[PDB]
């Protein structure tokens, strides 16, 4: 099955998911340069304060944090969006070593990690049928830089040795993902894709310009799980990015100039 080893790793997945050649895949690099201002765009609204986290997952792939979306609790709306996105897990992507780990890149520039805030638009009813949709869902992705220490993910770190294989999850109820955000909401958007099989092209894309800062300590503590399901050969869950795509016949807007 696919992954991020040698041998199952992106460069592989376009056999299993013929789409991973697609159009509209994520992630790209952003080239700070040619992307406009769009001045037609709105401010985004992050609307975060009835976000109701359940659990945390190890899926193989990442963590999630999954949250209670049977309601409109914790959405995202405006900025590019028509409508209401509901806000259904959060995950992140993160290297080996600290210069490597972001699926999006900046001028090239990979930082260290890469949090996706996953959402699906409630026009559509559930989450799978909004992946069906070309502007199903909105990922909010903010870039994690080593440096201080975040202090609101110290609750996700503390919880992770609990979670360390494939298939382990753990109650994680009352988590804040405000405490997630960095000062400015100002970012760039363009349609692209899911950046795991299946690989759909079913996302518009909301990065953030601004990174979070995490310690050097928060993030090492990501790199002791494990790929692996328990009691099979230990595989940390390092460099679990997909890289940049090619960005073909796609536009990246500004939000701010
Ligand atoms: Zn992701």
Redesign the pocket.
Same mark, same amino acid.
């Given at each position: 099955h696919w992954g991020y080893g040698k041998h199952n790793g992106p460069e592989h997945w376009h056999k299993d998911f013929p789409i991973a050649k697609g159009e509209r895949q994520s992630p790209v690099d952003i080239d700070t340069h040619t992307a406009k201002y769009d001045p037609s765009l709105k401010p985004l609204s992050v609307s975060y304060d009835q976000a109701t986290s359940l659990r945390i997952l190890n899926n193989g792939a990442?963590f999630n944090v999954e949250f209670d979306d049977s309601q409109d609790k914790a959405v995202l709306k405006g900025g590019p969006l028509d409508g209401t996105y509901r806000l259904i897990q959060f =995950?992140f =992507?993160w290297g080996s070593l600290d210069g490597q780990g972001s /699926?999006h890149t900046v001028d090239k520039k990979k930082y260290a990690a /890469?949090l =996706?805030l996953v959402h699906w638009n409630t026009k559509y009813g559930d989450f799978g049928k909004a992946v069906q949709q070309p502007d199903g869902l909105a990922?909010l992705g903010i870039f994690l830089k080593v440096g201080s220490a975040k202090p609101g993910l110290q609750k996700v770190v503390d919880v992770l040795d609990s979670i360390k294989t494939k298939g382990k999850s753990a109650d994680f109820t009352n988590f804040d993902p405000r405490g997630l955000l960095p000062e400015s909401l100002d970012y760039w958007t363009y349609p692209g894709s899911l *950046? *795991?099989p299946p690989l759909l092209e079913c996302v518009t894309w909301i990065v953030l310009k601004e990174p979070i800062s995490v310690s050097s300590e928060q993030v090492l503590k990501f790199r002791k799980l494990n790929f692996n399901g328990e009691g099979e050969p230990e595989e940390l869950m390092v460099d679990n990015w997909r890289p940049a795509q090619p960005l073909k016949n796609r536009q990246i807007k500004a939000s701010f100039k």
């Amino acid at each position: 099955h696919w992954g991020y080893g040698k041998h199952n790793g992106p460069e592989h997945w376009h056999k299993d998911f013929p789409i991973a050649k697609g159009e509209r895949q994520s992630p790209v690099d952003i080239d700070t340069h040619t992307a406009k201002y769009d001045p037609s765009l709105k401010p985004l609204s992050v609307s975060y304060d009835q976000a109701t986290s359940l659990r945390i997952l190890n899926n193989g792939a990442a963590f999630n944090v999954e949250f209670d979306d049977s309601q409109d609790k914790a959405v995202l709306k405006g900025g590019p969006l028509d409508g209401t996105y509901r806000l259904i897990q959060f =995950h992140f =992507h993160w290297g080996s070593l600290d210069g490597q780990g972001s /699926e999006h890149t900046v001028d090239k520039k990979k930082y260290a990690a /890469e949090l =996706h805030l996953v959402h699906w638009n409630t026009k559509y009813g559930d989450f799978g049928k909004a992946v069906q949709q070309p502007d199903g869902l909105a990922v909010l992705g903010i870039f994690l830089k080593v440096g201080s220490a975040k202090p609101g993910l110290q609750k996700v770190v503390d919880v992770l040795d609990s979670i360390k294989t494939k298939g382990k999850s753990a109650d994680f109820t009352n988590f804040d993902p405000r405490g997630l955000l960095p000062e400015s909401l100002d970012y760039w958007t363009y349609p692209g894709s899911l *950046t *795991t099989p299946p690989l759909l092209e079913c996302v518009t894309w909301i990065v953030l310009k601004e990174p979070i800062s995490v310690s050097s300590e928060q993030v090492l503590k990501f790199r002791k799980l494990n790929f692996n399901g328990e009691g099979e050969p230990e595989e940390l869950m390092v460099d679990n990015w997909r890289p940049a795509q090619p960005l073909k016949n796609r536009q990246i807007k500004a939000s701010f100039k």
